[PDB]
Amino acid sequence: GNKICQFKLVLLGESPVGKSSLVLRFVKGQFHEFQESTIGAAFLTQTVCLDDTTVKFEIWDTAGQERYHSLAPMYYRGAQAAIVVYDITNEESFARAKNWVKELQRQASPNIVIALSGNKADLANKRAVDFQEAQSYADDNSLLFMETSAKTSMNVNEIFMAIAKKLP
Ligand SMILES: Nc1nc2c(ncn2[C@@H]2O[C@H](COP(=O)(O)OP(=O)(O)OP(=O)(O)O)[C@@H](O)[C@H]2O)c(=O)[nH]1
Numbered sequence: 001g002n003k004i005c006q007f008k009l010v011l012l013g014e015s016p017v018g019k020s021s022l023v024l025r026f027v028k029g030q031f032h033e034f035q036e037s038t039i040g041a042a043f044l045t046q047t048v049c050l051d052d053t054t055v056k057f058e059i060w061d062t063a064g065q066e067r068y069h070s071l072a073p074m075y076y077r078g079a080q081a082a083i084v085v086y087d088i089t090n091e092e093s094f095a096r097a098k099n100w101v102k103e104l105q106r107q108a109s110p111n112i113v114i115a116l117s118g119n120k121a122d123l124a125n126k127r128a129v130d131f132q133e134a135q136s137y138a139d140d141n142s143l144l145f146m147e148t149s150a151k152t153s154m155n156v157n158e159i160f161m162a163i164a165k166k167l168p
Pocket residue numbers: 013014015016017018019020021022032033034035036037038039062063064065119120121122123148149150151152
């Protein structure tokens with residue numbers, strides 16, 4: 001196809017659930033066991049082929065530490081989509097993700113597409129968040145849910161592509 005589309009996507013979530021790792025896996029096909037904490041935000045881009053359209057992702061990888069909370073709107077304000085990430089081995093991170101979803105639903109663009117990533121799915125032997133419970137929460141709140149693993153690549157390309165498919 002000869003069509004070209006572009007959209008802004010922001011990743012939000014508690015530190016250190018794997019936001020930067022998810023982006024690095026999608027954009028560079030890499031995974032680093034040792035990743036420095038993000039400061040403020042980092043920016044990356046990736047262009048993919050979706051059917052007959054060349055979609056360009058402008059990705060804002062936010063720092064998740066609490067001290068950066070007041071900067072979040074600078075990154076989500078003009079976003080067309082968001083991925084709120086939690087760590088499946090940490091229930092508190094899942095509760096934090098729900099509060100990020102509430103903030104987006106109240107202060108981001110009314111038509112933002114929101115996805116929920118249950119990351120570090122490769123650590124299911126240490127699961128703290130039930131898959132079905134998270135799916136139910138996502139369904140009730142109109143969120144695109146997938147468990148992912150930046151470490152193995154599980155569902156990483158899939159979650160980004162599913163978001164792109166749901167954009168106008
Ligand atoms: N096992 C496993 N480790 C992961 C996964 N994703 C990230 N990690 C590890 O988790 C740690 C934190 O990952 P980051 O990507 O820096 O986390 P972050 O959400 O960007 O952290 P902040 O920038 O502080 O908000 C690193 O040691 C990663 O290698 C995953 O899917 N599985």
